[PDB]
Write a protein that binds this ligand. Structure first.
Ligand code: U
Ligand code: U
Ligand code: U
Lengths: 131, 132, 131
């Protein structure tokens, strides 16, 4: 576990349908993630700079290019996925290989229904990536 | 207060549920405890040899017997408790009077959110128990 | 894979229609699951303490509160679903975020006709949840 991470600039890209994963689900998930990440000493600080819905792997690269060009110092994009989807492989291709932007994927189900254990799982994955 | 302590073999036993004291809490607490104990000349070294959840006073003795048999040279078990619990008296009965195993209890609120002052409080207790 | 799990108190809630997933299908599935779980060293011990049909997402919260209020030490509710259904999200809403009750869902088609591979699939998922 890496100490000293501070996530100041971060975004949400929700590829799950808004009807399943609504804005108030995203906001409640955000506040719970902020609380546990701060308590664990890897604070995800502030609201996300960007939080939008998209659909389809074909929307990943245009969205991620916009994010990279628009938010200097963006440190992480949290990517919400509707279960098993080609969006995952495209997010990793665009983020890790095309553009060089850290992404952390999370299942829609764990945003719809947050629990401490799944938030913890997510923080540990983010810690590996950013530490 | 004793200088020159080195805690090389140590375990974590968490008797609060994972939903209350999650894996990221345990790992962050471990790393913060390693850092301050090293700076204060009583380093708790490395990763714990064992870090598991259990529930209820009845689980204490089998777990501690397992620990004593499995990890030779075990110097300390850090025991995470939710607060007041019968598990505390049983930890001390088994560790202090049955198996001769050092234990240090800590409340989950100070694992969920560490601070320098509460980690210092805990290191002072550990130093009393193990110094010398 | 976790060793040392023993499932002593568990329930079945069947949201699939009885005319598709009958009592003999449920008993067969139960007994086959018990045998393979023992093979694998995660014995599901005893018959379920409760095995009933349920109709609709509206039945989830009343039934799960009834289970919590009636069976001390309940470890798992195995939930049989008729394919894709809103019942799934409600089961997880109640179990994971209201009452703190472990649930394992299974598709009705794999209760109507079990195979060792689908029983194994289910055992692995239970093992992760309870481990
Ligand atoms: O199709 C997929 C593939 C992975 N995932 C999730 O992505 C997560 C891994 O994301 P990561 O590689 O950014 O760490 C993991 O929790 C998977 O469950 C999906 O939701 N859908
Ligand atoms: O039932 C109890 C008793 C003590 N404790 C805590 O145990 C700590 C002392 O542990 P110790 O005896 O191992 O030094 C102290 O911080 C108490 O707050 C509990 O959490 N529960
Ligand atoms: O609407 C749904 C959603 C999931 N399921 C099944 O639920 C299972 C997942 O259950 P779990 O989340 O309890 O592990 C998986 O086998 C899915 O196919 C349904 O049968 N219907």
């Amino acid at each position: 576990f890496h100490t000293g991470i501070e996530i100041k600039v971060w975004a949400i890209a929700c590829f799950a349908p808004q009807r399943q994963c609504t804005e108030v689900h995203l906001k409640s998930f955000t506040e719970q993630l902020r609380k546990i990440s701060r308590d664990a000493g890897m604070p995800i600080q502030g609201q996300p700079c960007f939080c939008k819905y998209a659909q389809g792997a074909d929307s990943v690269e245009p969205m991620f290019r916009h994010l990279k060009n628009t938010y200097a110092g963006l440190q992480l994009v949290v990517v919400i996925l509707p279960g098993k989807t080609p969006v995952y492989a495209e997010v990793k291709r665009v983020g890790d290989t095309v553009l060089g932007m850290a992404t952390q994927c999370v299942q829609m189900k764990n945003v719809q229904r947050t629990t401490p254990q799944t938030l913890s799982n997510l923080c540990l994955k983010i810690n590996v990536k950013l530490g």
